[PDB]
């Protein structure tokens, strides 16, 4: 109580200082309070530049999280050198996560607070929500017994979707399969290696048969779909000293991936030798829930979670010399701490078209689109 009050004051005072220092650290900071908090954020891949205008239009997939109100899947537009909701689609319960299919960015899968995983083609619904408040997904993907968060599309196999669930399983669907009644597709495969809540799943970005999963059992598992046994992964890695909440494959380094954990660390892994962690990124003060590699720079990654402050890392600086005073602030590979949020970060996304732009969303309804200044990452 007293202790809670002190933390709240520290957070607020730090935010006031952060605010006054933004010109030194950013080239852009746009803050926007959403009607409802979003648990999810992902930039869509396409940008629209208007004739004779000094800005381009980028788009984001967002969701709502309501108390006792109708939820929606949202497409928002963002003008980059205003934020508007363009498309609003009825969704059953909060949108735990929403991700577009690489081969057709009109297609979006969502995780719900139920066992169903949903698919929408957003161009095949009205831009304004149906007044009935009824959710009408284009597909219902069944196979789980519980809700979950992890979701991953195979960028080399059209329509191959993986999903992680609190039921301890991973479901795979090919959404091109012929649906039965109620537009249902049953899981093509179910992977049962984990012994606890599965938090995240991710396809390898080059090898179409490989994927990884992470769970509350503290394991990272590497799976190969060419194997007949779905109860035993190709590799089981003792990854962390607490729950593993996220993983991300490096788009430019085919052997490298990262995992983020309740143990406050991001671990770096080399698929050629998973017996030994390659590196441990330390600095976060609380549980990490999301980790994403930069779409533009192979050494750059970011992580976020309960400590409210997204960290950006540059693994090119691992082992570099720094003053002992600098060491007090963190390891050499810590590049940036984003101080813009005062609540837990629920998700974030790197802009795929404008380097160094990130959108992050937090539990207090805030969405921020921001770009660190060149003086941070250059030299």
């Amino acid at each position: 109580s007293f202790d809670d009050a002190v933390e709240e004051r520290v957070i607020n005072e730090e935010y006031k200082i952060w605010k006054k220092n933004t010109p030194f650290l950013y080239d852009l900071v746009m803050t926007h309070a959403l009607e409802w908090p979003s648990l999810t954020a992902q930039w869509l891949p396409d940008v629209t530049k208007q004739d004779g205008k000094d800005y381009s239009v980028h788009r984001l997939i967002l969701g709502t999280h309501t108390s006792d109100e109708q939820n929606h899947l949202l497409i928002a537009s963002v003008q980059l050198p205003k934020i508007e909701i363009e498309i609003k689609i009825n969704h059953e319960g909060e949108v735990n996560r929403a991700r577009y299919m690489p081969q057709n960015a009109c297609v979006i899968a969502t995780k719900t607070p139920s066992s169903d995983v949903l698919v929408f083609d957003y161009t095949k619904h009205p831009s304004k929500p149906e007044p009935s408040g009824e959710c009408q997904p284009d597909l219902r993907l069944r196979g789980h017994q519980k809700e979950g968060y992890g979701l991953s599309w195979n960028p080399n196999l059209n329509g191959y979707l993986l999903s992680a669930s609190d039921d301890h399983t991973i479901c795979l669907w090919d959404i091109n399969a012929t649906p039965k009644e109620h537009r249902v597709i049953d899981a093509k495969n179910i992977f049962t290696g984990h012994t606890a809540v599965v938090e995240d799943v991710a396809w390898h970005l080059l090898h179409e048969s490989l994927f990884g999963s992470v769970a509350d059992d503290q394991k990272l598992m590497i799976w190969d779909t060419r194997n007949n046994n779905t109860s035993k992964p190709s590799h089981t890695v003792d990854a962390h000293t607490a729950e593993v909440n996220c993983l991300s494959f490096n788009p430019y380094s085919e052997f490298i991936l990262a995992t983020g954990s309740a143990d406050k660390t991001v671990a770096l892994w080399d698929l050629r030798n998973l017996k030994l962690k390659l590196h441990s990124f330390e600095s976060h003060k609380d549980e990490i829930f999301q980790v994403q590699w930069s779409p533009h720079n192979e050494t750059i990654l970011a992580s976020s979670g309960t400590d409210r402050r997204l960290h950006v890392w540059d693994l090119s600086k691992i082992g570099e010399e720094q003053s002992t005073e600098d060491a007090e602030d963190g390891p050499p590979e810590l590049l940036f701490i984003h101080g813009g949020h005062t609540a837990k970060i629920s998700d974030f996304s790197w802009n795929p078209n404008e380097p160094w732009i990130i959108c992050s969303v937090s539990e207090d309804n805030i969405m921020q689109v921001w770009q660190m200044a060149e003086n941070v990452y250059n030299d």
């Binding site: 200082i17 650290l25 602030d329 590049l335 200044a373 003086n375 941070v376």
Partner: peptide
């Protein structure tokens, strides 16, 4: 200075 900025960056703007 570039170093001052990187320090401020690593300290989260505080």
């Amino acid at each position: 200075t570039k170093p001052a900025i990187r320090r401020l960056a690593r300290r989260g703007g505080v």
